[model samples]
Target: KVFGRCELAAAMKRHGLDNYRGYSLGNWVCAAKFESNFNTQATNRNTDGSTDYGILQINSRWWCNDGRTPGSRNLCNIPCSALLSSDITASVNCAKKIVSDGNGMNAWVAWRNRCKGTDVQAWIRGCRL
Candidate 1:
């Protein structure tokens, strides 16, 4: 699902993502834009046969079961396909756990590469929310 900037900001706030685990709303929003372009169904294949899932592109090898991956740790306690849903509650919740685990948004390569120490407000330029 493609979310407008304001919509995403509002949703993140509603979901308690703003400053959750001491990560900034800016970092979260920037990572969301760069990681999945606000598309909840986004997925990417990793070189190690793992898969990235959902808007945050969390890895299946560490967070969820992809069914094809036999030894998935499933730290998120969800099926990888659940991350593809348009409803972002599950995805947001899972991401919170990831952030609390000490990686912060740096856990996402997109965040490290694009959002780290960057201008986060630009990601939400015109949303009325």
Candidate 2:
């Protein structure tokens, strides 16, 4: 679902996302900003002919079955389109699994390429959370 500035933070905290796998909330907010602008339907085509799906922009090649590609690992055992849905429960769980596997926020290219070591506090600026 779409979220306002502090709305997402509240939800994330409720979902224990702030310290999930020892991650910071700013980075998750930063990732959502860059990956999908907080829109759960966000998707992007990759140069590798795969696609990134949902708010976190998870990869299709390994994470989920898009049905267009054969031999997809479907690591999350959920459809790629499921990630595009407004309900983020499955996506969040999958992301947690991905992070727990050692990639952490590095699993998100946006976090690695931009959010890391940046002035991420602004992501929570004025938020009640």
Candidate 3:
């Protein structure tokens, strides 16, 4: 599913993303915009032979196991395919685990480059939730 701004905010909130690591909901929304355009089925291949999956573009190298990534840790204990599902439950869970594991949202460079230290209030201003 491709979510609108407000829709994505609510979805993230439903999964406990708001202020998960001192980052606001808008920071997450902004990262999703740059990472996958808020699309559940998003995927990206990397030069390192790993793949990024789902809305937040979680990686196969250390997060989810795709079976194709060399030495993938599968720290999330989930199949990479799970991240592609429109349900987004697995993706959201794994994303939180990533942060809780101390990697922070910087696990996604898109967040570092586009959302970190930026005013992202515009991302959820009208979402009202």
lDDT of each: 0.85, 0.83, 0.90
lDDT of 3 by residue, 76-115 (tens): 9999999988787899899889877777888789999988
Model 1 — which ten-residue stretch has the worst lDDT? 120-129
lDDT of 2: 0.83
- Model 2 residue 107 CA deviation in Å: 1.6
TM-score between model 1 and native: 0.93
**What's the TM for model 3?**
0.96
Model 1 / residue 58 / CA error / Å? 1.3
Candidate that would win on lDDT? 3
Give each prediction's root-mean-square deviation over alpha carbons: 1.3, 1.4, 0.9
Q: What is the C-alpha lDDT profile of model 2 across 40-114, one tens digit per residue? A: 888899887789998889898889989776566799999899998877777788888787878778889889999
Backbone clash pairs in model 1 (N, Cα, C under 3 Å; residues 3+ apart or in different chains), count: 0
Using TM-score as the measure, name the better of candidate 1 and candidate 2.
1
Which ten contiguous residues of candidate 3 have the minimum total lDDT?
99-108
